[PDB]
Design a binder for this molecule. Structure first.
Ligand SMILES: CCCCc1nc(Cl)c(C(=O)O)n1Cc1ccc(-c2ccccc2-c2nnn[nH]2)cc1
Ligand SMILES: [N+]
Lengths: 402, 405
């Protein structure tokens, strides 16, 4: 009934994806997310379209549910005053500007910690708070290139490729969303806050893990394999009559299973393919033989023949197949929300499910400045007199829809 | 140590995970100070122990990369006495993590229902391929399969080419990060309720959620997605460009940045070109523009372009290999090369923690444990077994103790 983060206020100055994705997941867990946006423009994702639904872009809608919106010009001293007043009654402070940018505006950790020594201050940057290239802005495609992910992603004999989605941004967001709750836990015993440094470079290098460990320990360089792997064969995507199927065999018994299903038992006892080490050594000839067979049948036929095989196998699905998959719908991944002016909209739902509470009901993504007046009056106790003055000056903006 | 108090100190994690997703989650919790008790099969242990070469002594680099800051107890959970040991551990542990097919541990007497009965406080987190229930929930989880079924592979690869998978198991790692955050959400919730709960993380749910805007385009606009190689559908130019000896990523997020790039490339005539004057026009005329830019990028070395782009203020970066990654001073500056002293294998280096906190240090880590290295210590220190009961369990084969303690 009650979510674990209920009663936790998050002062959210994040933009784009990495930061907003972190605060969206905390909003799913019950946190009161107060999104601070530029009057007029707002979060950059608001203008990235088409596709557009009414006035809201699908980019913005996808990662900003379960948030409230206050449009405040934080470059204005009156806006800085509002941010500091909000931080004093908030538990978490999140931003993803270049290091020192918020500090130059009077909203750095030193400034905020002075008036909110309890606060958890989390900064999401491209390369960290300090260092030779720490002043560069963070970008997923740039980080995945510098961190080594792109070099190991792509066709074996082709150009490097990027993940279809900004996995480096999302991974960093997941690091931060966990780190913020670790800060809260630490705060619960000590009563004081701390500063958290998340960045795209650190997140992606850490995710290299064993691949990077192979070099740091064995001086082994990594390479691109397309859909295959360097140390285990066969294990890749195979072109079928109408699509692709991923199939793998991690040992001689799985390899026998695959060959029998493919009606190629003669390969099991062939001297070239009897062990995994030999299959890797003879991978080009083996994959060619297997690929010729895979392409003769439809994907649906191969999926039926592999039922109960006990080997890793799965079809390569497009968006149409993904959301026709009964398992996808079963997991609640099609989250529907009622937008006040745009109507019913559907986005990918929460990835984690808990037994003691439900997250299937989410507040729709806020309109720009939708909750400006509500926050100033209810959260900061501003009177109608002061709010009208800030509105008249343009320091804050209130959407027509409340 | 005295002043370096980590947030999760005093939290015990009963860790039955294997492979990558689960172990990655519990390793990050160990970095934060949690006491991770890794439960392993006697003799074999975690599957990754045998995944080699590369090998360092007897330990595989795969296993070492994601098992620091853990202790190892080798116990046979198929033995009724072993089930007893696991239940006794759960009673004094805060978290229980497993990544078996749904229902497997339940058939062994170690399901959530069984554990919650004797440990109503426990945070029970199961990491599966597709979730605890559903038509295909009984299939084992694999990163390559999940990325195929989830749609990531379909949208990853060269434009007009075959699908590709991420170089590393990002679906497993994303799921691991989801779980490592979810577990701490459970801990926080326990502060209020005093009770535990069950957590369902799976590869399919994690990856579909990461589709975000791409999925919304279909769910809302019925629009199908495509592969773009390294470029993007809504912003041009922004992709990887082949240089004379490698690749460099360069982008222009607005007309002013596009002018900056053109001047650096000695192509000022493009700034006022009717086909490329705005981003909307550059996207529409992307094919011809990229060819013109690609022709120039290929004439100079990556080192030359990096020098010419200094201070440009536009998004740019080289495509680094492992050698370039760990020669980059920024990477070393962030402490990402974590060195550890293994008791039998010696000094080893792995990627360090990604997050840095101002109130504590995580640069000093316990090396990944040897199989059953801490069996006796855990039984005596954590469960209060005496020397005779422990000796009987060793003689009976219920548990195993490594030569190194
Ligand atoms: C010159 C760079 C132009 C823009 C920009 N400014 C920065 Cl900063 C970044 C960065 O964070 O990389 N970007 C690129 C970028 C743009 C959009 C998104 C995004 C937003 C919401 C929902 C999903 C996604 C997404 N899902 N999959 N891919 N995108 C994410 C990243
Ligand atoms: N971002």
């Amino acid at each position: 009934n009650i979510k674990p983060l209920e009663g936790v206020k998050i002062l959210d100055l994040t933009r784009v994806l990495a930061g907003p994705f972190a605060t969206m997941n905390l909003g799913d867990l019950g946190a009161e997310v107060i999104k601070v946006e530029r009057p007029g423009a707002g979060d950059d994702t608001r203008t990235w379209g088409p596709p557009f639904v009414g006035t809201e872009s699908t980019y913005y809608l996808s990662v900003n549910r379960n948030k409230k919106s206050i449009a405040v010009n934080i470059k204005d001293p009156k806006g800085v005053k509002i941010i500091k007043e909000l931080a004093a009654v908030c538990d978490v402070f999140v931003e993803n500007y270049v290091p020192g940018k918020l500090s130059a505006m009077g909203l750095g950790y030193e400034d905020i910690d002075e008036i909110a020594p309890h606060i958890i201050y989390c900064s999401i940057t491209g390369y960290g708070q300090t260092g030779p290239i720490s002043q560069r802005a963070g970008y997923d495609a740039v980080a995945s290139a510098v961190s080594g992910l792109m070099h190991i992603t792509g066709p074996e004999n082709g150009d490097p490729v990027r993940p279809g989605v900004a996995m480096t941004d999302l991974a960093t967001g997941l690091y931060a969303y966990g780190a913020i709750m670790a800060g809260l836990i630490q705060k619960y015993k000590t009563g004081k806050g701390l500063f958290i440094d998340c960045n795209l470079l650190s997140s992606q290098v850490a995710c290299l893990s064993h691949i990077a460990a192979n070099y740091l320990i064995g001086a082994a360089e990594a390479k691109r394999w397309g859909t295959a792997h360097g140390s285990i064969v066969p294990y890749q995507a195979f072109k079928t009559k109408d699509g692709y199927i991923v199939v793998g065999a991690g040992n001689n018994q799985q390899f026998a299973t695959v060959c029998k299903i493919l009606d190629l038992p003669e390969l099991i006892d062939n001297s070239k393919y009897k062990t995994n080490h030999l299959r890797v050594h003879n991978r080009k000839e083996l994959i060619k033989i297997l690929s010729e067979r895979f392409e003769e049948e439809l994907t649906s036929k191969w999926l039926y023949l592999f039922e109960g095989s006990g080997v890793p196998y799965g079809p390569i699905n497009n968006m149409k197949n993904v959301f026709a998959e009964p398992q996808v719908l079963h997991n609640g991944l099609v989250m529907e929300m009622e937008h006040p002016t745009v109507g019913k909209i559907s986005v990918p739902g929460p990835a984690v499910r808990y037994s003691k509470f439900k997250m299937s009901e989410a507040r729709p993504p806020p309109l720009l400045g939708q909750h400006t007046t509500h926050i100033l009056k209810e959260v900061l106790r501003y009177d109608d007199r002061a709010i009208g003055e800030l509105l008249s000056a343009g320091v804050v903006d209130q959407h027509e829809t409340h």
